[PDB]
Amino acid sequence: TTLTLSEAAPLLKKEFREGRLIPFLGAGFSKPLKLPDGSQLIASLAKTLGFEPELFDMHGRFEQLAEFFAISAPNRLQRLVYEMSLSFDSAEAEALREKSPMHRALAALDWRTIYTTNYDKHVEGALRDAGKQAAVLASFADFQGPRARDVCEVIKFHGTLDQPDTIVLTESSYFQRMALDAPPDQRLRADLLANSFLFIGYSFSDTNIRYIWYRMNQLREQSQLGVKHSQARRCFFATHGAGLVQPDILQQWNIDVIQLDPTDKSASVARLLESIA
Amino acid sequence: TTLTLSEAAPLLKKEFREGRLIPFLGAGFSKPLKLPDGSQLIASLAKTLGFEPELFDMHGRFEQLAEFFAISAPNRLQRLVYEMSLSFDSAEAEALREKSPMHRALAALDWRTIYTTNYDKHVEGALRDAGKQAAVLASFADFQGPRARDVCEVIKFHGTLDQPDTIVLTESSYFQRMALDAPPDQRLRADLLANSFLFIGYSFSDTNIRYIWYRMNQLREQSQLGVKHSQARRCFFATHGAGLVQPDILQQWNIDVIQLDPTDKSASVARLLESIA
Amino acid sequence: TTLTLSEAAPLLKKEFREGRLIPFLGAGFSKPLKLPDGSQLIASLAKTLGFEPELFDMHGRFEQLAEFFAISAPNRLQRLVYEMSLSFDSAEAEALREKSPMHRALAALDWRTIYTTNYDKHVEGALRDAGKQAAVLASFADFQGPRARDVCEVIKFHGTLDQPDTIVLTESSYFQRMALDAPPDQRLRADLLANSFLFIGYSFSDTNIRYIWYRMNQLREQSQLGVKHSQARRCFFATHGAGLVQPDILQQWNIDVIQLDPTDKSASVARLLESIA
Amino acid sequence: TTLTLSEAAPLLKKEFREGRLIPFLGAGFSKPLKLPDGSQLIASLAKTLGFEPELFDMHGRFEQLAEFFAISAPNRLQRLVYEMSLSFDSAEAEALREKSPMHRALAALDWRTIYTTNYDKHVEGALRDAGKQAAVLASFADFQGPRARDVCEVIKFHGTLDQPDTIVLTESSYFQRMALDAPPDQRLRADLLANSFLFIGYSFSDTNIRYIWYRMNQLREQSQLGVKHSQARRCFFATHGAGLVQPDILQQWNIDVIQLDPTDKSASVARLLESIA
Amino acid sequence: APTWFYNTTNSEKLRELQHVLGGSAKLGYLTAKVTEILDVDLETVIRAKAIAAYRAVRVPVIVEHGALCIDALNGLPGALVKPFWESLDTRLCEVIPAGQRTARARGALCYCDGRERHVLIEETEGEIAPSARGTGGFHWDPIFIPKGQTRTFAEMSLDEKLSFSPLGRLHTRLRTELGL
Amino acid sequence: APTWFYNTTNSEKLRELQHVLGGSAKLGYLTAKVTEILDVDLETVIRAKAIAAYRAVRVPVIVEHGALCIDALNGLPGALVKPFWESLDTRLCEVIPAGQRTARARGALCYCDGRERHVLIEETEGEIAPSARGTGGFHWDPIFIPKGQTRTFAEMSLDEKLSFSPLGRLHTRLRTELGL
């Protein structure tokens, strides 16, 4: 009911040599850089507001606690972006990034499009470390700006720290992305029409990501394809610790789960990215 | 920062005598009828699937555990509606409903529209107990069907048990309502343009209810009203146990919180509905 | 010309100890549970439509009056299934079912297949009361679903209330079953090739049941068996009040009539089921 | 909800001048010839069997009482056909047939196909009275026999008295026609694909006629025509005394009811057949 | 073509209802024979007479049944008036004691459209005559004298009888409720 | 198991027929309620009562209906005796003139096996009492005095009443024709 690493490796080679495999990188991909995930941010927002971090967690979800933070005082969200810039893109996080085996194995492949939902320059920065060049696309001005001819386009799906208007963190910013009208939303839905995705270090907790894969099946089911042909183009979900409910929800959306070895999280991902080559 | 019962009582009389107050009733309004809330359903779905009810709860949210239930076997959702109809609309739940002080105090007022998100005939059934007559509107055929002239229209916002296609319980049914295209969605957004609402026994956990009040502020903020005039038409949220984060999120959406006495939940609601008269 | 109870008792023991006797249960088998038969449903459909129950009866047959009900308004049949579910499978009908002597005498025998044409869980529910376990088979997904190894299969021939698409009540649903292509139709015609049936509480008024026993004689007469051998495998029809015409029609179809004592209908059936043991 | 005579008259002229209108004549069309209908036959079968005619009627339907008659003694059905021949086709029924205004108005039109379900030579005999010539088609040998070039084909749908093997009267003969494999069945289903029918003196009580119009809608609904185009080709049902249920059942099957004046049954039919000319 | 049909086998009731409701083009006439149930209550018999006449003619039908409840006979005949005038013709004036001759002439229409039965009842106080007098009218009209009047239904013309009889108030109620 | 079923809702008729035909093991008892037609002729009502009771119980059934034809009322009530004793209880002794008190107590059994209806009729001459006397029995037994006897049916015991009543001759005719 779940692919292993050796089973999923010839399936990922076929989609990569055809140029139809696109990585989707989450907050767990920057975990070996000693960065906060979605839980250590809330522990830092609770310290500023005067909450204990265990009491602040039980008043709402991740989107709702950041919405409460941003309206506590004026200019409270601007300060957070400044603080995150200092801690996510610091020089000691740069130094952990050249010697990271996941970021080396990611940049060794010749991708054309990479999607990320984290606010750090460590995915395009991994491509600059390997001598390659990348193109960060986050806002409308980036898509219409000049690029080079054949350069890997890194789509910052949730925003970048050097453009603080593009960061979606609060609940009102997730509701603004439910219209699927932002330039990262329109680019994602067109790439999903034709490409397989590889989710690495990401857990489907964002209700706007799950809503995009929902509405691709409304195109898939209305097109009245067979049992054989509607199940042909799959997406892949590499996860150490998926539960018992979530892999069966995603089978509806043509998403297969690749079970990685949970003893060493960083080496299991790196062996997956080296098996694509 | 929070209205009491005596403070909110003249504010609710003014909107009621103008005919611009509409109740919005949740799952906590049927709690004195000994019915399950959103947690005792999941305890019953876990027993059918072979889970322990505490282990089944930590694999996903309420929408996602019901999505996992409905795809476990064919015709698994149809059976749930049949079982729910035996236990929610049973004869002993009818007998607890005439002697309930909340349902008597609700039907004593001369409403014109009532919205509910629960699957039971105990809101329109409370109106039949007081000699009044109601009109259940759940699907497209109900809105175009014949009614009488001046009859309280009960809008089953999430569906009714006698029309099992209208029940939104699983995650795919909540995503289908994100388009705001269903007949209860279109009727709600037009009533929200002109009326104050009174949330009784409901907690804002549905991401499609919160998205409707989100997009009413996008009309409110784009209309460029003043500080005084954009804050004039309020909605009211009667809750015994609102936390510390959620009342400040809803102040953005012109929703005021009415703190009820948590020692006796049923008598606190009944004194609120009697203060409107 | 008609078997008595003591005459038919050694004939039913022989077919039961060979495992070739199958009960066929009708609407009169749920009459001691205070449930409607085919006449009190029409009295309830006439009240909804605004007819007097004696005037509504003289405009058509049972199949045709339910066809007129289902097309009077949209979602009018779905409501009927919901109402029947709450009335037929209520808790007070459960409590009358443990102390019913017919349902105790039915479950005391070790059957392998039971056919019913009524929409209630009181035939498989009688088997659960005796500690035995049953398997309800009504739709195509039930036949291909998983069962246990040696469990009495209860074939809901006309449908079940927890699967409202399987209920055949209207005239168009009886005409859809004339093709003999439904999964309860195909299972019945194969069991009729090899087994004796015992009709209890059922009167041959359904023109699709009579058409199945018609076409078994077209196999019987074309096979050119003798007078002795074509009359060997009989079926049994226990009835308190069969007329003067119907027992001679069914002699054509190898169906013998067992005359039960009409003074007490429930005790006469219970003595028949205890004589098989 | 029901056409009158003047409303239905231009609708019948259009289908007749295109050659796409076919009469369907029942037992009420031979009622002015002083012949038995379906109730006076059963009164005559009860006299032979020794029943009182009111007691014999309450033991079964019309098909089932004739099945009981035919198996009471050997050669009992052959005698009935002989008796019916002497009574239905007698010389005094011939003399009432030239002066009948319905049979004159029927033969004045230049039909090409006429269907009847009655066992008498008074529909083709009406065509011989007007100087026209007819061709009775009842069995397989009649369809392959020689006819003339342009002669009205009278399809005896239930059989003729001069071919006693073709008469369907008993219940076993109606069940043999449920396969829709007889030569009158195959000719009817192909004419129903392309022509409007006019039911005169017939009441839909035969479950094989109703099953043919049922399965024409299964072709009509599966072809996925619009609301406008699936309702274009209608059939017409002239009846003095249709109830309240049966006209709404037949609206499903594109059958419109023409209400005739019930004070004089013979003159109301004759004015309908003269309005087609 | 008519939409309502007044069913009676009594040709004297037919010329009364055609005297007032005759010009209505929405009313037809049928002559089917039905069998009444055995009960003295007028409401029970006329309601079971319409269900038995709709079963015969299968169109929206209007039936009519009467009553001649008498105080000296504790309400007898009631709706059993049809076999009394057959048995006791003018001896019915003699079986009732002189001094307590008071009686009620009741009459009921019931129209059935195939789904509902609606009963219209009117009623006339009166007293049984000491002997039968008068030639006009029909069954039991020479024996009934209305209250205030000295004459019988038989002594009065058809315009004058319908200004006292229950049918003269049932014309307007049947015309209004059916739109005749 | 029985093969014939005697249908009555009157529990006083039940203990009479079980007093004589009670030991017959071929006779059962049912209590279905039927509605009689409106006719004074006993033969017509009992024949339409068996077809209406076979339709209810669907077994070979035996029904019973009576008559109390009176000379002073020209045969009234006849088979209309059920609503007279409801209306006129003991005033029925007073509405009949003294001097012509003669009457006939008729009674009829009709058994229907589902194909044929056979009517057995017996009859007892008598005269209506000047006033109701006696406590035993049931409906109209305190008012009827048989011919030759001075006492009523109410004054006599059940053995003595059935030596005069029509049912005492209908036991033997029903037992012989049915083999009870």
Ligand SMILES: O=c1nc[nH]c2c1ncn2[C@H]1C[C@H](O)[C@@H](COP(=O)(O)OP(=O)(O)OP(=O)(O)O)O1
């Ligand atoms: O207003 C009335 N003025 C004078 N006589 C009346 C009246 N109304 C009823 N009568 C007589 C007629 C019949 O002798 C008996 C009613 O019995 P009734 O069943 O209605 O007469 P019926 O069977 O002959 O005709 P129908 O088929 O309309 O019931 O009392």
Ligand SMILES: O=c1nc[nH]c2c1ncn2[C@H]1C[C@H](O)[C@@H](COP(=O)(O)OP(=O)(O)OP(=O)(O)O)O1
């Ligand atoms: O021999 C009799 N000795 C004394 N009284 C009798 C007798 N026979 C009938 N009666 C009384 C009973 C009832 O008051 C009426 C007949 O009416 P009747 O319809 O037969 O009585 P019922 O409806 O209560 O019972 P059942 O269902 O058997 O008809 O005269």
Ligand SMILES: NC(=O)c1cccnc1
């Ligand atoms: N840049 C990151 O690592 C990060 C962590 C948590 C949430 N968003 C981004």
Ligand SMILES: NC(=O)c1cccnc1
């Ligand atoms: N009918 C109800 O009260 C209910 C409760 C919880 C969820 N859905 C419905």
Ligand SMILES: NC(=O)c1cccnc1
């Ligand atoms: N479940 C039942 O008893 C029933 C009754 C009537 C018709 N079908 C089923």
Ligand SMILES: NC(=O)c1cccnc1
């Ligand atoms: N020949 C006829 O008129 C007829 C009547 C009734 C049934 N079948 C035929």
Ligand SMILES: [Zn+2]
């Ligand atoms: Zn009459």
Ligand SMILES: [Zn+2]
């Ligand atoms: Zn009676």
